[PDB]
């Protein structure tokens, strides 16, 4: 139980691969996702080499304790992987074929700027710290990287499970460290978003705009203010349950603009009344009449500006 | 501790059986359910065979470490099953009778399209990866598949516990994998749904429709808008608190239609007043009178269309 | 480590016992209660017999690994018991005296039909699967059953901790299984219930009835509708946090009836106004005057009907 | 190994103590608190006694496996303590000095009757079950009982960590049990309660009382009812998140009283209008004028009665 | 497995270092943060020293069980560290180079007085208890104290990861303790705070101030009270979810002042009406006109006072 010696002065290349079995619990708030997968490792340890003629066997099976296995760890895991060795197979030349089944809650940041049209790239970082005896470098076996066809994330389109084939080798505390990036690309499945979140919220803003075809200040205060309460209550109903993102989101910008529209509508309603009370019903009625077109138009344009601005 | 050798080139047939002891924690949000059950495994290892005359014993009991046991794993489990071996029995011919008790949170998707009248089929996938020495294939022992009569899920009718007898054998990473599906069929209990969710939500809506027997715009704005707030508060009140399904549900469609009805009712109330203010009380009163029948009728039909459309 | 042999063809009687140390985490939603307790087990393994003269000890203490212990398991536990062996003592005859401190989240259904006046019987099921060598049957040593006086459940009166002395012996997967029932009887502590839940909700409904001493439709719409919003907001404030029980509860029936009363009150208010607007202030005022008595009376009787109906 | 033998017929006295290192996660709802602390155990085992002259060492260090250690357990812990042995030191006379570092979630009831001015006594119960060979009794070593100066609980003043020096020795299942009570006294930091909870809630109440300087029934219904909604919404905003305490709290009594005041205020507003409509504006105006003083006075007195009643 | 002996009467110096790999789950409510990092320990054990000539090896690798490793523990961790030894290397002189990978939820208080402009210093306390044989003192190896560049906390600026080089040596339960302070500095990066929390909350407040350009008491009651409900509902929407901080926060002071402004605005509205009803429309209109400037000015100044007062 010591690393295999180098033929020359070459480092030990370990052939990695992750095959996704199950993907679940994608926590948008915590920026985590639980994955249940296979981990395939391969390296050549000539100390384990055998003659298939003399041995009379094609490949020999070993116990993890019996042979030297590289210390492969994950970088962005919450709690260390629940490892279960499935099989260890040494071919006659000494090439070890290691396979384990694991499950891990992965920490991977998410960008909600383009939400709910957002797409995400989920990372799984593999790492190996080079020993005293020799240096270890990770490699990707593209045949052993993939995902089950049943692999799902509710509300997401699982685009691809790939791996940046070139490791990021670097020095950490006077030792070499070889890091591999495994990427899971997903795009949001948002059709229910329009009837469930946008349209209802829109009718609410629209009900406020009916105050442009009314002269009763009592009815108009009730119109714009009550729809504001209705809007806040509606947003309480839908609400994401995630702490505010430090950055400004697309949906967040629209919501901000909606609060601004309720404020401006109150200004109009207030002005309309003050002009009417200050015996200027020419200006009072003209503003109201303008707003009837101004509010829907400006809203429509301001959303076009934002949509363009974010996408 | 190596697989039993084949008589000829035949694969190892492992006879399974899952007997449900307890079923609990069905998370509609997470699409999981925890299950407490028995796992019965059986295979013939002639290396372990004996003469009952010479041995003087009926059946010999072994420790898991002592004999070769196939690596049976579950496909759709969150964290690897809490396994406890109950008994291992080897009959004189070498037939191993393995039984373990386990508990695992099983990831199984749910279809809420027909909610709350929905029925679900819960999957438990058994799998075995074929070794170098020989190929392993799973089989179902229908005598050892069942469930306790005490097995319950609050709010569900546990219909059946059945098993797809024919395994799905396939190749994965150059090795054969035999997969079995165990189905748990459940149907929802929607007794309380009508008085707890549907009826109060309908009363709130009907309160809005009373604005068709009134000419006071102040009282009418108050009627349709306040019921809208009441409706949103009532929906906050029900609190399913499951993130919106990406897809459109039956209940979700009705709710959408309800938001639309509140909007249209505001249009009517607004129009009624504008016609009355624009000295056309013939059209004003006629629309209000029409709506008195139009709103209940269109609602009734639109729900019939949906009910039919979803069921 | 094999069962003790029978003198004649008698089964092994494992005398049991459960002594509650702590009881906590009663989750009404999950139908679970966490219990921290002692487990007392006794059987005769004559293979362990000794002469105290030759031994020099009147009783010998053993490690769990050293001797044969029955495989006792709990039926309705979420995750396998957190077992800690306190003591194993053998008397000269070979009578084993086992004691273990365990803690487990027990799954036991709850009947909320009579809530908040409901009483519950929480179950803890002990089981043992009979082996090939000999059959095992469980018994209750009534002296080693009981509960600490400090044992509490906030908001419940812990009535008793008793055992169904006669085990339920049955056949499961061709083997005998002996099951014991441990019952924990509890009754709820309502009383905060009247000032915290009923009266404030009851006041809100009476505030709606003040619309029977008013003729202003604007003030009456505001009265009955605003109290409806107040009622929903109040129920959001109290709310149980449990998903709807599939069955109709007593409290749930009252709440349903309250929603119905808000609807009927809106009908009255609407009718009163329509009669007054259709120049029939004789009928308008008579209905309002009737309601003044009708609403409180019908409510009082309808609650009496329900109280009687549920209890 | 086996307990030390008694010199005469005396029981083994175990001197126990621990200094709180960290205290965190005080869950008011669950009546639990996580504590991270030291556990110091001491007893004399003359079998381990040595001559410091012959040995040439002052104190010998042992491994837990090597010597006999008493089975000390905690009575009120959720899941069994996370024990880590720091040091075992045996003095020449045979006095063992055991010290472990542990962390455990402790179940200890809380009395919210005087909330938010409440003070609490948190219990940690130590226990030891006496063996067959000899009886074990617990003692407190006051030098080894303490709490870190850094030990904090957010929103609590950590007063004293003391221990009831005299154990509660009792018989349980025919064996002696010695129990020590360690108490953690804390007082609540209620400063932010006045500006955050009591004053905004009261401003809301007073806004309702402005209806005593108004004659408009429409404006008065709006005043008292809308402030009621505002009050419920405000209470939803502040809300503790803890299930209802079965008993009546001080804050709970005030809140009850507030709901009663909103009801009575609606009675006044209703009466005032009915008298005014019944052409009796002498009585109408007199009641309103009375209330202007009656409501603030009765409130002030009723709170004095309660404050006195609870404290 | 006993501490190395001192050359003279010197204590054993253990050179420490913590390298942050991942930082996640910063719970503002619980005052915790999970950290995934490296722990580098170094000391000289001359009992392990060797001749590189005779041995033919530069550095020898040992198993944790084989050699003596100091009992290093963390002070402020929730649950015992998830330790995994990466490498143990002994140089010819006997200098041990220990490296492990750990993950732990660290309890570290937070000061929200200056929230959301607040900055925090996160502590990680290393400790070692001095043994009987010799005294142990901790040291910082500044070369082995860093953080990964990828290390992130969403909504925070990870400024630095430093260590107080001089340990805090003290006596605890008659033994010497050496404690090291590793402090992580983070400044809250909450850009989105103004458009997401402040701006909408202010629009809501200003809507109330429009009641200064109106004489309709019905419309004015509706203005100030409804905006107050809107404000509470808005605050329910943006709710932090953390229990009230015992102390007064900056944001909390502003919110308090906002509740006070809604109260004063109701006083004005009430007074304005009473003066108008008591035939004094000179004073009524003058106060309303004053308020138009008084309310915005006093608000602006009062916020300047607070901003200055807190920062
Ligand atoms: C004319 C008073 C209407 C009133 C009940 C009003 C709207 C101003 C409403 O409709 N809803 C709510 S939640 N608050 C209010 O004050
Ligand atoms: C008219 C004001 C409506 C108030 C709605 C409040 C909803 C709060 C829900 C909070 C759930 C925890
Ligand atoms: Cl890991
Ligand atoms: Cl599994
Ligand atoms: Cl169990
Ligand atoms: Cl314990
Ligand atoms: Cl630690």
Q: Give the SS3 label for residue B17.
A: coil
B133 chain-A contacts, CB cut-off 8 A: 61
E241 pocket-lining for ligand 2 (C-beta < 6 Å): no
CB D183 within 8 A of CB D57: no
CB contact under 8 A, D154 and E245: yes
**Can you tell me which atom of ligand 1 is nearest the CA of E229?**
13
D226 pocket-lining for ligand 1 (C-beta < 6 Å): yes
Q: E264: number of CA atoms within 13 Å, CB side? A: 16
Q: State whether the Cα torsion C230-C233-C239-C242 is positive or negative.
A: positive
User: Which part of chain C is CATH 1.20.58.390?
Assistant: 193-311
Neighbour-count burial for D67-99, b at 16+ CB within 10 Å, e otherwise: bebbebbbbbbbebbeeeebbbbbbbeebbbbb
Radius of gyration for chain B, computed over Cα atoms and rounded to the nearest angstrom: 31
Judge residue E301's burial from the number of C-beta atoms within 10 Å of its C-beta, 0-12 exposed, 13-18 middle, 19 or more buried: exposed
A79 chain-E contacts, CB cut-off 8 A: 82, 103
Q: Which among D210, D216, D220, D239 is the top mutation candidate for probing chain E, defined by the most E β-carbons within 10 Å of its own β-carbon?
A: D210
Q: What interhelical angle do A199-209 and A217-238 show, nearest 10?
A: 170
DSSP state of D77: B
User: In testing the pocket of ligand 1, which one of E207, E208, E217, E226 has its CB within 8 Å of the most ligand atoms?
Assistant: E226
- For ligand 1, atom 7, name the residue with the nearest CA: A222
- In angstroms, what separates the C-alpha of B158 from chain A's closest C-alpha? 25
Of D79, D109, D235, the CB nearest to C103: D79
Provide the number of CB pairs (under 8 Å) joining chain B to chain C.
130
Q: Give the SS3 label for residue A186.
A: strand
Of B79, B173, B266, the CB nearest to A82: B79
| Ion ligand 3, residue ranges at CB < 5 A | A 73-74, 77, 80-81
State yes or no: cis peptide before C302, omega within 30 of 0: no
- Please choose, from the candidates B226, B302, B211, the residue with its C-alpha nearest in 3D space to the C-alpha of residue B265: B211
Of C78, C229, C244, the CB nearest to B196: C244
C229 pocket-lining for ligand 2 (C-beta < 6 Å): yes
Q: Where are the alpha helices (DSSP H) in B28-132?
A: 52-55
Other beta carbons within 10 Å of A135? 20
**Which method was it determined by?**
X-ray
Distance A103 CA to ligand 4 centre (A): 11
State yes or no: cis peptide before B116, omega within 30 of 0: yes
CB A21 within 8 A of CB A37: yes
- In angstroms, what separates the C-alpha of B225 from chain C's closest C-alpha? 10
E229 pocket-lining for ligand 1 (C-beta < 6 Å): yes
B86 chain-C contacts, CB cut-off 8 A: 71, 129
* Structural domain D193-311, CATH architecture: Up-down Bundle (1.20)
Q: What interhelical angle do D199-209 and D281-310 show, nearest 10?
A: 160
CB contact under 8 A, C78 and B215: no
Q: Which among A126, A135, A228 is the top mutation candidate for probing chain E, defined by the most E β-carbons within 10 Å of its own β-carbon?
A: A228
What Cα–Cα distance (Å) separates residue B15 from each residue in B19, B77, B243? Answer: 14, 21, 40
**Can you tell me which atom of ligand 1 is nearest the CA of D225?**
5
D229 pocket-lining for ligand 2 (C-beta < 6 Å): yes
A206 chain-B contacts, CB cut-off 8 A: 263
CB D296 within 8 A of CB D265: no
Distance E91 CA to ligand 3 centre (A): 28
Tell me the β-bridge partners of C263: none
Q: Which H helix or E strand runs over D106?
A: strand D95-107
What span, in angstroms and rounded, lies between the C-alpha atoms of A132 and A8? 16
E30 chain-D contacts, CB cut-off 8 A: 24-25
C307 pocket-lining for ligand 1 (C-beta < 6 Å): no
Q: Where are the alpha helices (DSSP H) in D146-280?
A: 193, 199-209, 217-238, 250-277
Other beta carbons within 10 Å of A299? 17
B236 chain-C contacts, CB cut-off 8 A: 236
Judge residue D274's burial from the number of C-beta atoms within 10 Å of its C-beta, 0-12 exposed, 13-18 middle, 19 or more buried: middle
Strands (E), B82-236: 84-90, 95-107, 119-129, 136-140, 146-147, 156-172, 175-188
CB D38 within 8 A of CB D100: yes
D189 chain-E contacts, CB cut-off 8 A: 246
Of A103, A192, A216, the CB nearest to B244: A192
Neighbour-count burial for B46-60, b at 16+ CB within 10 Å, e otherwise: eebeeeeeeeeeeeb
What span, in angstroms and rounded, lies between the C-alpha atoms of C92 and A281? 110
Pairing type for strands B95-107 and B32-44 reads: antiparallel
Neighbours of chain B (3+ CB pairs under 8 A): A, C
Neighbours of chain C (3+ CB pairs under 8 A): B, D
What span, in angstroms and rounded, lies between the C-alpha atoms of D268 and E44? 86
- In angstroms, what separates the C-alpha of A12 from chain B's closest C-alpha? 23
CB contact under 8 A, C207 and D226: no
CB contact under 8 A, A86 and B75: no
Task: List the resolution, Å.
Answer: 3.5
Other beta carbons within 10 Å of D279? 8
Pairing type for strands D146-147 and D175-188 reads: unpaired
User: Which part of chain B is CATH 2.70.170.10?
Assistant: 1-192
CB contact under 8 A, B223 and C221: yes
To the nearest 10°, report the CA torsion of E283, E286, E292, E298: -70
Q: Give the SS3 label for residue D53.
A: helix
Query: Which pairs from A290-293 meet CB under 8 Å and 24+ separation?
Result: A291/A209, A291/A212, A292/A209, A292/A212, A292/A213
Q: State whether the Cα torsion B213-B218-B221-B224 is positive or negative.
A: negative
- Give the CATH superfamily of A1-192: Neurotransmitter-gated ion-channel ligand-binding domain (2.70.170.10)
Q: Give the SS3 label for residue E92.
A: coil
DSSP string for residues in E95-111: EEEEEEEEEEEEE----
């Amino acid at each position: 139980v010591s690393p295999p010696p180098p033929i020359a002065d070459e480092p030990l290349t370990v052939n990695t691969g992750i095959y996704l079995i199950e993907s679940y619990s994608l926590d948008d708030c915590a920026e985590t996702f639980k994955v249940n997968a296979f981990l395939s490792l391969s390296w050549k340890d000539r100390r384990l080499a055998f003659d298939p003629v003399r041995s009379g066997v094609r490949v020999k099976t070993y116990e993890p304790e019996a042979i030297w296995i590289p210390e492969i760890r994950f970088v962005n895991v919450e709690n260390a992987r629940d490892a279960d060795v499935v099989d260890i197979s040494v071919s006659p030349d000494g090439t070890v074929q290691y396979l384990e089944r694991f499950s891990a809650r992965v920490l991977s940041p998410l960008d909600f700027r383009r939400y709910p049209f957002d797409s995400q790239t989920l990372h799984i970082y593999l790492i190996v710290r080079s020993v005293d005896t020799r240096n270890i470098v990770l490699a990707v076996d593209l045949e052993k990287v993939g995902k089950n066809d049943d692999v799902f994330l509710t509300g997401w389109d699982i685009e691809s499970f790939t791996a940046v084939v070139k490791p990021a080798n670097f020095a950490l505390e006077d030792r070499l460290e070889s890091k591999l990036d495994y990427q899971l690309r997903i795009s949001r499945q948002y059709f229910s978003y329009i009837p469930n979140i946008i349209l209802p919220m829109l009718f609410i803003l629209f009900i406020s705009w009916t105050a442009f075809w009314s002269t009763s200040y009592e009815a108009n205060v009730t119109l714009v203010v009550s729809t504001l309460i209705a809007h806040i209550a509606f947003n309480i109903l839908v609400e994401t349950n995630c702490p505010k993102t430090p950055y400004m989101t697309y949906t967040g910008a629209i919501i901000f603009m909606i609060y601004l529209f309720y404020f401006v509508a109150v200004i109009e309603v207030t002005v309309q009344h003050y002009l009417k009370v200050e015996s200027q019903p020419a200006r009072a009625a003209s503003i109201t009449r303008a707003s009837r077109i101004a509010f829907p138009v400006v809203f429509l344009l301001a959303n076009i500006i934002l949509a363009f601005l974010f996408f």
